[PDB]
């Protein structure tokens, strides 16, 4: 991809100030005239198998467009250097949005935001793309509109010892299937992400919509790994402080220990409807 292979007309794109680092390159603000987010990646892997998967996935994302999914625009690869360009999201991350004092969530607003997220995930799933990284920090809320970012991105194999370092916010969104497989020397690309793991991550963001915090208070990651992958921690949170029966029913469904008992996103739309 030389960026002219995309349906977005491109003359020139300029880097602006950076706006956060992470495991997958550095994300800058930029100007396409429109604002954009530009993620800079570098491919250690070089074995042309990694770039083959990168090319496949970037042209798979071309086929996407939906008002609840961030617009994928371009990707160019001058190996080892690669760049992924999406539309820039004004407004605030849902993560920092539920955690605001001044914010007024309610039994209505929460269902509406949730239905937005479900529509977006349902599209992505229909076209066979798995998010693999749904969380509150990868959803943006600007006035009425809700947009999912940073999807599909965990499938790639760029630069990131035999220990592990796992942020707590991330692990709260991880289903038991995954955290059981975590262990030093195993890369993120080998983990069992899936449609069901995505609806589990939706379970955590819904809990965050109810309680405006993590479902597990910050603690040693080994503790979180056991509590998450045993299902115990999720059994105890459902016990500990409850919300409403119909609200909590969707939560118990999404967090279901056996992944196969987790609902589809289409079904979750209906469940969110039959509520106050």
């Amino acid at each position: 991809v030389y960026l002219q292979e995309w349906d977005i007309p491109f003359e020139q794109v300029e880097l602006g100030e950076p706006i956060g680092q992470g495991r997958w390159g550095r994300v800058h603000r930029g100007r396409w005239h429109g604002e954009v987010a530009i993620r800079l990646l570098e491919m250690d892997g070089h074995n042309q198998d990694h770039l083959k998967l990168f090319k496949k996935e970037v042209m798979n994302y071309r086929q996407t467009r939906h008002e609840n999914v961030v617009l994928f625009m371009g990707a160019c690869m001058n190996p080892p250097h690669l760049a992924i360009i999406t539309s820039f999201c004004k407004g605030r991350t849902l993560h920092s949005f539920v955690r605001d004092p001044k914010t007024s969530l309610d039994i209505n607003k929460t269902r509406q935001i949730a239905q937005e997220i479900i529509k977006g995930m349902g599209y992505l799933h229909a076209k066979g793309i798995v998010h693999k990284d749904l969380k509150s920090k990868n959803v943006f809320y600007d006035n009425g509109k809700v947009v999912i970012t940073d999807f599909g991105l965990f499938g790639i194999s760029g630069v990131v010892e035999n220990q592990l370092k796992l942020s707590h916010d991330w692990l709260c969104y991880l289903a038991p299937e995954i955290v059981r497989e975590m262990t030093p020397g195993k890369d993120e690309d080998q983990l069992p992400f899936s449609k069901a793991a995505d609806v589990y991550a939706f379970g955590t963001v819904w809990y965050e919509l109810q309680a405006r915090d993590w479902p597990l208070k910050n603690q040693a990651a080994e503790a979180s790994i056991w509590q998450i992958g045993s299902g115990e921690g999720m059994k105890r949170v459902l016990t500990s402080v409850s919300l409403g029966k119909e609200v909590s029913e969707i939560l118990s469904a999404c967090w279901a220990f056996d992944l196969q008992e987790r609902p589809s996103f289409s079904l979750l739309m209906d469940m969110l409807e039959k509520l106050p």
């Binding site: 497989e181 262990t183 040693a220 790994i225």
Partner: protein, 311 residues
């Protein structure tokens, strides 16, 4: 208290050479060699230039919002009040280049994990003395500043050719624990079964960690899962099944053929899964194994330097 005078005359000696060094900053120091690195940051043998002293510098690398960074440094400065013959000599803590550095005593023989790998196994005669040292350090910490350690394992037990035992890297600062230290998981686990399920824990969790550490050093092998029958006379698992073992299976125990009841019972009491029934520190201090080893006569410095090769 209950501070011997030999000890009190080497504590004063190091607090008053301590005020001779004054303050510091990065370029005052100069490298020597690779002590090692892990679960946060590298530590290197260093010589300080203003005041002819050799130290050990712990650098850990944390780009985060500066407000909590200065909160961390001010919480970490409490190490200046923490001074015992069983806690490594602390000198200073400062921020530089967004890399927090802690300057502490250099301990000639390194960590009992290092000691162990070269030694292969650690005898009982001597594990008695280290056990006394650990309970003393933990009681000093709980009574005087009201903190707990939260990470007791051989790589955090330090030994010198002068024959002392002291503990390093205890959890003094909460912010540093919540902001960095929590996110790491290694290949082994020393966490109590009540910490792993996320209930409220206490220094009891440290009692468990100490028990597991003593087993490892006594038999030379990380004790869970328990060695198999062929491996025991002679003397590949992911992290979650390790943790599920710790929580859902019996704890390790020392082999019955080799060590006394007093040692076997000491470790059995440290490793009870229910922290309520696990011995506390008051009870461990008066245990038979402790009364024995405290009144025994072992020359530690000699064993250490002939184990590893110092002078």
């Amino acid at each position: 208290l209950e501070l011997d005078e030999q000890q009190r005359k080497r504590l004063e000696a190091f607090l008053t050479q301590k005020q001779k060094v004054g303050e510091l900053k990065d370029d005052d120091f100069e490298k020597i060699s690779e002590l090692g690195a892990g679960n946060g940051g590298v530590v290197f043998k260093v010589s300080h230039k203003p005041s002819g002293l050799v130290m050990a510098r712990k650098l850990i690398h944390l780009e985060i919002k500066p407000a909590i960074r200065n909160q961390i440094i001010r919480e970490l400065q409490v190490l200046h009040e923490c001074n015992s013959p069983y806690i490594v000599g602390f000198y200073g803590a400062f921020y530089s280049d967004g890399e927090i550095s802690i300057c502490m005593e250099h301990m000639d023989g390194g960590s009992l994990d290092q000691v162990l790998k070269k030694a292969g196994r650690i005898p009982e005669q001597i594990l008695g003395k280290v056990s006394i040292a650990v309970i003393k350090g933990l009681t000093y910490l709980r009574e005087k500043h009201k903190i707990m350690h939260r990470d007791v394992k051989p790589s955090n037990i330090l030994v010198n050719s002068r024959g002392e035992i002291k503990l390093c890297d205890f959890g003094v600062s909460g912010q540093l624990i919540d902001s960095m230290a929590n996110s790491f998981v290694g290949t082994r686990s020393y966490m109590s079964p009540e910490r792993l399920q996320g209930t409220h824990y206490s220094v009891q969790s440290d009692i468990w960690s100490m028990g597991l550490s003593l087993v490892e050093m006594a038999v030379g092998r990380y004790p869970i899962p328990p060695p198999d029958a062929k491996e025991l006379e002679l003397m590949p698992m992911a992290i979650f099944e390790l943790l599920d073992y710790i929580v859902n299976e019996p704890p390790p125990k020392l082999p019955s053929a080799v060590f006394s009841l007093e040692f076997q019972d000491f470790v059995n009491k440290c490793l009870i899964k229910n922290p309520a029934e696990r011995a506390d520190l008051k009870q461990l201090m008066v245990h038979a194994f402790i009364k024995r080893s405290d009144a025994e006569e072992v020359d530690f410095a000699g064993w250490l330097c002939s184990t590893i090769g110092l002078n």
